[PDB]
Amino acid sequence: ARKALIEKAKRTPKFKVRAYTRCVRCGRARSVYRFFGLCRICLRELAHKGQLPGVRKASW
Amino acid sequence: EQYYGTGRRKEAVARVFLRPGNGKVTVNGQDFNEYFQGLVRAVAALEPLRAVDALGHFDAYITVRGGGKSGQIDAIKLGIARALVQYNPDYRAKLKPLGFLTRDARVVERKKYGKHKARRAPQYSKR
Amino acid sequence: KTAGXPHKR
Amino acid sequence: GKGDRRTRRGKIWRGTYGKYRPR
Amino acid sequence: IRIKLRGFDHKTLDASAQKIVEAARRSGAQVSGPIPLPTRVRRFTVIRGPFKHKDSREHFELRTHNRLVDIINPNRKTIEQLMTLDLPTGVEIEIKT
Amino acid sequence: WKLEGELRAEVAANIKRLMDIGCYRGLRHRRGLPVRGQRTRTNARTRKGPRKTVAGKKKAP
Amino acid sequence: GNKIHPIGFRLGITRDWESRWYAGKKQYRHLLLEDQRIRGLLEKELYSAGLARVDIERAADNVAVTVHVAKPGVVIGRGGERIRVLREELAKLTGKNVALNVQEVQNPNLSAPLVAQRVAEQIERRFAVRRAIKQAVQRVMESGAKGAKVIVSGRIGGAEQARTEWAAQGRVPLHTLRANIDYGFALARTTYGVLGVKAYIFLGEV
Amino acid sequence: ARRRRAEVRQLQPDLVYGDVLVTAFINKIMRDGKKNLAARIFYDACKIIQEKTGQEPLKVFKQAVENVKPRMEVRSRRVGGANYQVPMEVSPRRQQSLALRWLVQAANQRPERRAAVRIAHELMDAAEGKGGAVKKKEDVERMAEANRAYAHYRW
Amino acid sequence: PRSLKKGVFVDDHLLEKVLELNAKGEKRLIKTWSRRSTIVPEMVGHTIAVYNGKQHVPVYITENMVGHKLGEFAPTRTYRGHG
RNA sequence: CAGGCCUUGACAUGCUAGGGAACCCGGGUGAAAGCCUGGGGUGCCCCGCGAGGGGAGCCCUAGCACAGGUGCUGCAUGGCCGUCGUCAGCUCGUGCCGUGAGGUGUUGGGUUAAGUCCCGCAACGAGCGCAACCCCCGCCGUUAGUUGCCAGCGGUUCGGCCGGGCACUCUAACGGGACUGCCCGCGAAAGCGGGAGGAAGGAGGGGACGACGUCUGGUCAGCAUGGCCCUUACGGCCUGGGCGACACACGUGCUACAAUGCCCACUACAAAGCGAUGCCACCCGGCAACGGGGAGCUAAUCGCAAAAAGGUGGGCCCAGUUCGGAUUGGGGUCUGCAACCCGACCCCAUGAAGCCGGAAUCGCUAGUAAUCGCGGAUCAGCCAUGCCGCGGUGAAUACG
Numbered sequence A: 001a002r003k004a005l006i007e008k009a010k011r012t013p014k015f016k017v018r019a020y021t022r023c024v025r026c027g028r029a030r031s032v033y034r035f036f037g038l039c040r041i042c043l044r045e046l047a048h049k050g051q052l053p054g055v056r057k058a059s060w
Numbered sequence B: 001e002q003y004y005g006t007g008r009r010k011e012a013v014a015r016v017f018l019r020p021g022n023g024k025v026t027v028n029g030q031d032f033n034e035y036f037q038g039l040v041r042a043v044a045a046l047e048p049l050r051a052v053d054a055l056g057h058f059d060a061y062i063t064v065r066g067g068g069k070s071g072q073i074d075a076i077k078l079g080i081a082r083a084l085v086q087y088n089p090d091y092r093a094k095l096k097p098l099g100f101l102t103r104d105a106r107v108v109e110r111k112k113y114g115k116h117k118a119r120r121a122p123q124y125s126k127r
Numbered sequence C: 001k002t003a004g005x006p007h008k009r
Numbered sequence D: 001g002k003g004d005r006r007t008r009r010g011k012i013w014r015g016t017y018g019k020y021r022p023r
Numbered sequence E: 001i002r003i004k005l006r007g008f009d010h011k012t013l014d015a016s017a018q019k020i021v022e023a024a025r026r027s028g029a030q031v032s033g034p035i036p037l038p039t040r041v042r043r044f045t046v047i048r049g050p051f052k053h054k055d056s057r058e059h060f061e062l063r064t065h066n067r068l069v070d071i072i073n074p075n076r077k078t079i080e081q082l083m084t085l086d087l088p089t090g091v092e093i094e095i096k097t
Numbered sequence F: 001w002k003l004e005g006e007l008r009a010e011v012a013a014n015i016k017r018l019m020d021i022g023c024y025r026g027l028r029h030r031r032g033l034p035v036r037g038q039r040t041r042t043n044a045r046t047r048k049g050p051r052k053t054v055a056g057k058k059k060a061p
Numbered sequence G: 001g002n003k004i005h006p007i008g009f010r011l012g013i014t015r016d017w018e019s020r021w022y023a024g025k026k027q028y029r030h031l032l033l034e035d036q037r038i039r040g041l042l043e044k045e046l047y048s049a050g051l052a053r054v055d056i057e058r059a060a061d062n063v064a065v066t067v068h069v070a071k072p073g074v075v076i077g078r079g080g081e082r083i084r085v086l087r088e089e090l091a092k093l094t095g096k097n098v099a100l101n102v103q104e105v106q107n108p109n110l111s112a113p114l115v116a117q118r119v120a121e122q123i124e125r126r127f128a129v130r131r132a133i134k135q136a137v138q139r140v141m142e143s144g145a146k147g148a149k150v151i152v153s154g155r156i157g158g159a160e161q162a163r164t165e166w167a168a169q170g171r172v173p174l175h176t177l178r179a180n181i182d183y184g185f186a187l188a189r190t191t192y193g194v195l196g197v198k199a200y201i202f203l204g205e206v
Numbered sequence H: 001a002r003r004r005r006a007e008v009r010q011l012q013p014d015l016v017y018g019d020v021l022v023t024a025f026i027n028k029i030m031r032d033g034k035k036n037l038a039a040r041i042f043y044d045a046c047k048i049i050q051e052k053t054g055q056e057p058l059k060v061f062k063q064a065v066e067n068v069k070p071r072m073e074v075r076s077r078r079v080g081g082a083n084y085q086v087p088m089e090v091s092p093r094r095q096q097s098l099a100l101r102w103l104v105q106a107a108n109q110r111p112e113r114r115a116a117v118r119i120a121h122e123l124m125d126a127a128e129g130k131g132g133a134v135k136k137k138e139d140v141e142r143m144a145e146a147n148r149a150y151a152h153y154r155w
Numbered sequence I: 001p002r003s004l005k006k007g008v009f010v011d012d013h014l015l016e017k018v019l020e021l022n023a024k025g026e027k028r029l030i031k032t033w034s035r036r037s038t039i040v041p042e043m044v045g046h047t048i049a050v051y052n053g054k055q056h057v058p059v060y061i062t063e064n065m066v067g068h069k070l071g072e073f074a075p076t077r078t079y080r081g082h083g
Numbered sequence J: 001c002a003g004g005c006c007u008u009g010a011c012a013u014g015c016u017a018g019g020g021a022a023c024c025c026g027g028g029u030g031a032a033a034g035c036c037u038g039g040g041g042u043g044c045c046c047c048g049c050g051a052g053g054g055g056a057g058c059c060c061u062a063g064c065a066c067a068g069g070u071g072c073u074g075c076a077u078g079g080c081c082g083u084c085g086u087c088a089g090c091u092c093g094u095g096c097c098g099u100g101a102g103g104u105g106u107u108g109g110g111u112u113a114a115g116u117c118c119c120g121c122a123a124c125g126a127g128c129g130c131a132a133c134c135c136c137c138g139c140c141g142u143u144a145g146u147u148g149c150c151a152g153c154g155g156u157u158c159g160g161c162c163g164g165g166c167a168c169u170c171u172a173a174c175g176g177g178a179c180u181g182c183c184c185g186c187g188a189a190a191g192c193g194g195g196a197g198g199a200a201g202g203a204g205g206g207g208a209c210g211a212c213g214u215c216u217g218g219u220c221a222g223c224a225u226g227g228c229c230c231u232u233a234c235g236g237c238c239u240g241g242g243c244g245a246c247a248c249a250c251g252u253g254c255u256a257c258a259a260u261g262c263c264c265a266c267u268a269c270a271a272a273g274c275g276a277u278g279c280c281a282c283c284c285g286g287c288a289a290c291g292g293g294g295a296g297c298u299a300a301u302c303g304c305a306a307a308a309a310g311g312u313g314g315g316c317c318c319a320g321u322u323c324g325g326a327u328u329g330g331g332g333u334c335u336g337c338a339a340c341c342c343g344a345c346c347c348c349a350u351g352a353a354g355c356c357g358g359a360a361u362c363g364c365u366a367g368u369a370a371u372c373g374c375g376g377a378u379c380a381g382c383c384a385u386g387c388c389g390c391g392g393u394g395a396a397u398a399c400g
């Protein structure tokens, strides 16, 4: 239950509650940031890669 | 007509204006003992002049924002001690030996990932 | 060893 | 204490308001 | 003539602030200097590993710096010259009155 | 207001009819189990009572 | 299982983003998805041209897409034929003004993603992994670099026991921030599974 | 504390009597960072201790501290796997610390409802040689006298 | 519970079956998967087969159970104790 | 998991074939999915006054190829992570010694947080590590003066409110600054002690950063991937259920057992963040949750907002209580299609255990521990007492 579920998420749901976030890149239904539309894993991979504008490792 | 110092300590910043007078102080638009009422530590912000005997010779107009009422106090204690050496550079000695000329960098340490606070750790238990 | 489908466990 | 919703400290603890901590 | 510009890289942001402030310093009159607004920070804290390892993280921030420049007396020689200006891609500008 | 013994009558009467009809709450007043949807895997000791320890599963020597 | 990524470690210092633009919380994801969706198509096609980088810049309803490459030929095409045929298909997904460019790679053997891809490709052809590594390092140092290290990890030669093997020359100080270290990864699929090639090229300190 | 021995923190003298020993004693009263409340308790008792028994408050405080400082205590040493009770002379730093610590603890064991009264009476009883904190000092001094046989293991 | 500014909630497709019965001279067994339906005075006297995830459980409706929900009388877990 | 359904399939490319569909609204049945169905009616280019016939986005159905699998193998793998360990280490080139594994260098004296340096030496160099370059904090400067600031004049509905100004506080970019650089002493040196100056002194405090490798450590369920297995089913859609069960046992936590406390009223002082189907001032209804109005702000402007501990005054008087707030009855509010299973919140009533915890065991060396509140991510709501952050108050102790 993966590809059918990554496709059903894009679909408009019978009710606005059944809509849930989903990583655009890998398809994770969990730990999905609204801002990037990514998940915590892909977010880390693209940040280290430099393909996320302005984002960088924070240090304080 | 004025003598100014900037006192900082722990997110609290102080602007001290020392004008000659009866020894009357106000802080943020109200009286000293009105703004520090009930805080025994309050009498420590006016300690530097005790070292130069300037007790009742200066009135003080002082504003403070940020931090907390005890961090604000230590800022005042540095601020007036910073204005006095501006008024009288000779106040260098007898003030620096009393450490009134320095600001402590002692601020809150950041919380870190995998702890409860900066150093308090989650409880350990093998098995 | 790891339940998943038929193998269940 | 903080566990009693029917007091001010409890309302603060759960971050709610009511008769026992109004605005 | 109220001009605010934004970006993630401040070096590109402060650069384009110095350009425009000197565009009105050529033709025009009074510039209100490039005043820096407080930086708004959106942070992201992630479990550093793909599985299980909760007590190991990694922090990421996204900084959106803000600069403000005000042109006092416009003089449409400036309002013309501004149309031709090299504005890098890392900066987005907004103008009101 | 109705008070003391009179109040306890209606509290009893409501619990009893919850058990009579056989709703999910009345089933939990039967068995003395938590009624407001709490966990029973642990805790529940106020509603369930003092612990009744049992022999467990063992390892190999 | 411990070392941090060498680029993301130096971003804003010795390395700059491969997507340079501003956006707001309203359409940041929509644009970033576009970058990824665009960058997906490019690496798929321009692979045979040896794609070493994709730069993206944006203003509004327009985009840069500066493609660095070792062989501008497979990009431009006949008098600018492929460069058009792709730019056509490009904005066919962007719906914007997509102005593709093509920058030449000075020394390809001084680019990390290329060295990794040459080794990843060489081992798909069943070449001696241990040798391909030493040669690649040898080329990068002959190309003047101040240091190089190359890592292949997996079932080398198809062995059942997985293994890691590497070679290095000069110096590669990953802990040093002012040290420009180009990093690049290439993944080689084989009859027996996936291998992983890490290339580290140390250009110099700034 | 392997490398170097630690440094002893110097305390800001109190804003009334200007005495470090007073500041240290308030810190032993303080719980959860409430030094304001702490100093407030200590001073209220100074009132009580000047009302009852009209001596000077600060004078009663210091003498009570003196009557609670232990000059000898037992520690542990080795010689094989054995665990001896060795009588040791108490350092001035430690005499003060144990005296202050036992006072608050003895005070809080008292039955008076409010905190300042417990501290007032304990400081009074201690300055006259009674109280739990003095009974604790004499108790410690006894155990070092009994195990005086093992005094030759001292360092 | 549900805001009374909203309605006493019934899935309609069940209330439909109930009302046609009252008109036609009930009874009839009623199989529903709608546990979330609120019992309602038009249901008094019938028996409703409420699904509990595995089976449709008959529930004779009485006056004293009118205000409740349907799933309350089709328990969802079989337990019968330990040991 | 149960049951009702779908069979080139929810999805990818590719091949035909019939309809020849595009798109948007309906109907019957049904829990829904599904099955059955009815209307609004195709641009390319064309033979076009002709009936129109084809070609094609894209659709529908039939049929293939193939898709699909969070099925298995982390003992086939990539990638990433944990870990030893921020421990001072692991090595290489040539030379020398040894038949050889290998040794030497890297040992030794001294030194340091450190294979950090000094000195010595069949060793002489070099690499990965250490340190440094990077970030936050502490002092100072410069450049800036609105939405931030108000020192001093001028008005002032008495609110930095208007004039005025950028001094200051600030905000945010670039610089300065510390080097054991100076003095004394020890020393062969590196360094060590002490002192001066200084906001800061011996790496200033915190962060980012994790050597060759180890655990055949973790992850085939984020993703990728070899191989094995399923193909009207281990794939796919749906409604409902379960993931929340409960004789029990363990971990991590919240709230407490009270007077340095609890309650009520009044009154102060933060920081970091967040906010256009968002934050929502202010007003009214309501004990209230909230509802209804209804400004302002794409936000150093308007809002979240009250910070809490604290300060003042007042009450309780050592009680299982004006401690504790579990459990349960009843009544409501909000989100949501829907709160039975199985939501949060408000109000009335209920007011359990618990009198400081057996054997045992954990954290922390300073703005730390303890305590006090604040925000954010996820997010309709929320079982968050969790996590990542933020500041307020602020200790004890280190002989060894």
Ligand SMILES: [Mg+2]
Binding pocket: A001
């Ligand atoms: Mg399935």
Ligand SMILES: [Mg+2]
Binding pocket: A002, A003
């Ligand atoms: Mg998949």
Ligand SMILES: [Mg+2]
Binding pocket: A017, A019, A020, A021
């Ligand atoms: Mg949701």
Ligand SMILES: [Mg+2]
Binding pocket: A020, A021, A022, A029, A030, A031, A032
């Ligand atoms: Mg999600």
Ligand SMILES: [Mg+2]
Binding pocket: none
């Ligand atoms: Mg600051």
Ligand SMILES: [Mg+2]
Binding pocket: B108
């Ligand atoms: Mg704190």
Ligand SMILES: [Mg+2]
Binding pocket: none
């Ligand atoms: Mg907290």
Ligand SMILES: [Mg+2]
Binding pocket: D001, D004, D007
């Ligand atoms: Mg109470």
Ligand SMILES: [Mg+2]
Binding pocket: D015
């Ligand atoms: Mg809030």
Ligand SMILES: [Mg+2]
Binding pocket: B122, E054, E055
């Ligand atoms: Mg944890």
Ligand SMILES: [Mg+2]
Binding pocket: E056
């Ligand atoms: Mg780590």
Ligand SMILES: [Mg+2]
Binding pocket: F035, F036, F037
């Ligand atoms: Mg419930």
Ligand SMILES: [Mg+2]
Binding pocket: F036, F037
């Ligand atoms: Mg509940």
Ligand SMILES: [Mg+2]
Binding pocket: F036, F037, F038, F039
């Ligand atoms: Mg519950």
Ligand SMILES: [Mg+2]
Binding pocket: F037, F038, F039, F040, J244
């Ligand atoms: Mg339950």
Ligand SMILES: [Mg+2]
Binding pocket: none
């Ligand atoms: Mg084969």
